[PDB]
Enzyme design. Structure first.
Site, short mmCIF file in Angstrom:
data_model
loop_
_atom_site.label_atom_id
_atom_site.label_comp_id
_atom_site.label_asym_id
_atom_site.label_seq_id
_atom_site.Cartn_x
_atom_site.Cartn_y
_atom_site.Cartn_z
N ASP B 82 -33.03 21.11 48.03
CA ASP B 82 -32.12 20.43 48.78
C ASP B 82 -31.12 19.99 47.71
OD1 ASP B 82 -32.83 17.97 51.30
OD2 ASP B 82 -31.20 17.80 49.94
N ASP B 93 -24.99 17.41 52.09
CA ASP B 93 -26.71 17.46 51.71
C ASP B 93 -26.97 18.79 52.46
OD1 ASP B 93 -29.46 17.42 51.42
OD2 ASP B 93 -29.42 15.42 52.49
N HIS B 153 -30.56 12.31 58.55
CA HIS B 153 -29.85 11.02 58.20
C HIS B 153 -28.43 10.99 58.28
CE1 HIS B 153 -28.88 12.50 53.87
NE2 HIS B 153 -30.04 13.28 54.37
N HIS B 161 -28.18 7.77 52.83
CA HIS B 161 -28.96 7.53 54.07
C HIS B 161 -28.13 6.27 54.46
CE1 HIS B 161 -31.86 9.72 51.82
NE2 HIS B 161 -32.10 10.38 53.02
N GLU B 187 -32.21 17.76 59.21
CA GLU B 187 -33.14 18.49 58.35
C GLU B 187 -34.57 18.36 59.01
OE1 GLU B 187 -34.25 16.26 54.30
OE2 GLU B 187 -32.28 15.32 54.92
N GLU B 280 -31.47 22.21 56.11
CA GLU B 280 -30.84 21.34 56.44
C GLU B 280 -29.40 21.41 56.15
OE1 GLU B 280 -30.65 18.28 53.05
OE2 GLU B 280 -30.80 16.47 54.42
CO LIG Z 1 -31.34 16.86 51.77
CO LIG Z 2 -31.08 14.77 53.66
#
Ligand SMILES: [Co+2]
Ligand SMILES: [Co+2]
Ligand SMILES: [Co+2]
Ligand SMILES: [Co+2]
Lengths: 295, 295
Positions: B82, B93, B153, B161, B187, B280
């Site tokens: 990630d 992200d 998120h 977030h 994600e 994600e």
């Molecule tokens: Co992430």
């Molecule tokens: Co994330």
């Protein structure tokens, strides 16, 4: 605005709730029950935020009678009564589980107890997750599963579910922060099943949603009335069951639905048909403590 | 502001991501790995949004090496990568699961496939729940459990977030509406376990939160460092291991922790130690379709 209104709605909702617990006796027809509650709320000084929900056992929530339901209570049932009042748009959403004609047990205790814990920690400054976890522990330390898709919600003037939820579980990133003046409905659901709910027909409760020019005349007007009579608040098919023929009403609603003018909110049933206990209070997030409109 | 920045962050994260997949070969030390990625992101033109996360198998996420980790990949592992890049605060992200030195399987497929679906429906106008459901079906129709406490998120400038989530399940009241200009990270995590994660020590990532007059001296300087170089974005402990000797470092953190200055984000592990696949991407909610920064 007027915290007194959120208080009044809360106050009515308390009384009505209390009385419902009483009318909740064996053989009592759900339909009589609802009607009584709604009109009480009425004569008491306020309109309903949403049709009373009388959900039995595995029926998690979203169940309301309709002109025609013969269903009557039965000794030993886990009846769930979720009531909501509103003074000009200020909601009070409370709820309780009553073991029909019997005394509470471990399941019911778990939900109640859980709900309580959540309150003790709510106070401006805390992150949602804290309540979440709280709820989760009480439910699980008692060997029960908390539902993962039904959960607390943040209320706003003329908006029952305003966006922020208060899970009955601990999700490590729920980091919304309880601000001052925040109005939240905390509602832990407990079950012995799997801990999740699915939607099953029929669709008794509906939600007004958006202007969408419909071709079929009647439908359009049905909608118009809807707009003006219910607003943003979710309403019941039972509330329109006399404003046109049972048959023709349906379609209008559907067409309205297949048009995205109004959303239907089908019955919620625990997946592995597990019993579902539940308790809910509404709060106002204050600095060092929270005031419970429905105490 | 500059959609181009969200794009740039997105673009770097893509490349870096791509490369990491390659460096993901057996016996490869997680620590070399992370370092590479972070420095690549760097030399590519941007700062990391958060320390690369290399989570192995039942380790859902929130795992990052530290100066000292001897841990090396192992053929057959489900490494999860990630990464997040940010141009002046515009995050990207993205993330992927790689079967170390092997080809993907049903699990990995489930999470990927799931993710895709979510995108297909994202478009200004839909309710979060739609995505949620989507995800839920792809993961479950393949007999896999989706994680219920780890989820997408909504991102915002210098806020990883931002409050609204995108569950990997269908919670009937997730009715936030995808606005135009919305930036979200979708994600889905999939698992053969129970479908839930718990926090287990240690605490590698931390995040600044608020200015607190602290009593211990170095912590206070540590605080203002964290403040200036890291900011609202989260950091790794591995990033500060030079700035002071083990012992003293820890304590300056711990004090701050207690101070209520920096929150720590422990490791996340699937409860019944079940495998965890994940994918994600970040999106920008446009009128009729969504732009995937990390395509
Ligand atoms: Co992430
Ligand atoms: Co994330
Ligand atoms: Co309620
Ligand atoms: Co409620």
């Amino acid at each position: 605005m007027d915290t007194e209104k959120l208080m009044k709605a809360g106050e009515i909702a308390k009384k009505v709730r209390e009385k419902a617990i009483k009318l909740a006796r064996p053989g009592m027809l759900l339909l009589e029950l609802a009607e009584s509650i709604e009109k009480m709320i009425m004569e008491l000084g306020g309109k309903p935020a949403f049709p009373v929900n009388l959900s039995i056992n595995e029926i998690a929530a979203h169940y309301t009678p309709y002109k025609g339901d013969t269903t009557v209570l039965k000794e030993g049932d886990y009846l769930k009564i979720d009531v909501g009042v509103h003074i000009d748009g200020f909601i009070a959403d409370t709820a309780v589980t009553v073991r029909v004609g019997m005394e509470e047990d471990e399941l019911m205790e778990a939900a109640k107890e859980a709900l309580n814990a959540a309150i003790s920690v709510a106070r401006a400054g805390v992150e949602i997750k804290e309540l979440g976890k709280a709820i989760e522990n009480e439910i699980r330390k008692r060997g029960f599963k908390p539902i993962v898709n039904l959960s607390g919600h943040k209320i706003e003037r003329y908006k029952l579910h305003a966006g922020i939820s208060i899970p009955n579980i601990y999700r490590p990133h729920d980091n919304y922060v309880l601000k001052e003046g925040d109005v939240f409905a905390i509602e832990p659901f407990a079950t012995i099943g799997a801990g999740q709910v699915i939607e099953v027909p029929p669709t008794l409760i509906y939600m007004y949603v958006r202007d969408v020019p419909v071709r079929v005349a009647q439908a359009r007007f049905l909608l118009a009335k809807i707009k003006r009579e219910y607003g943003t608040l979710p309403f019941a098919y039972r509330w329109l069951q006399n404003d046109m023929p049972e048959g023709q009403l349906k379609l209008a609603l559907k067409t309205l639905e297949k048009a995205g003018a109004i959303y239907g909110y089908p019955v919620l049933k625990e997946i592995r048909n597990g019993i579902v206990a539940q308790f809910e209070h509404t709060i106002i997030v204050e600095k060092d403590s929270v005031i419970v409109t429905t105490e």
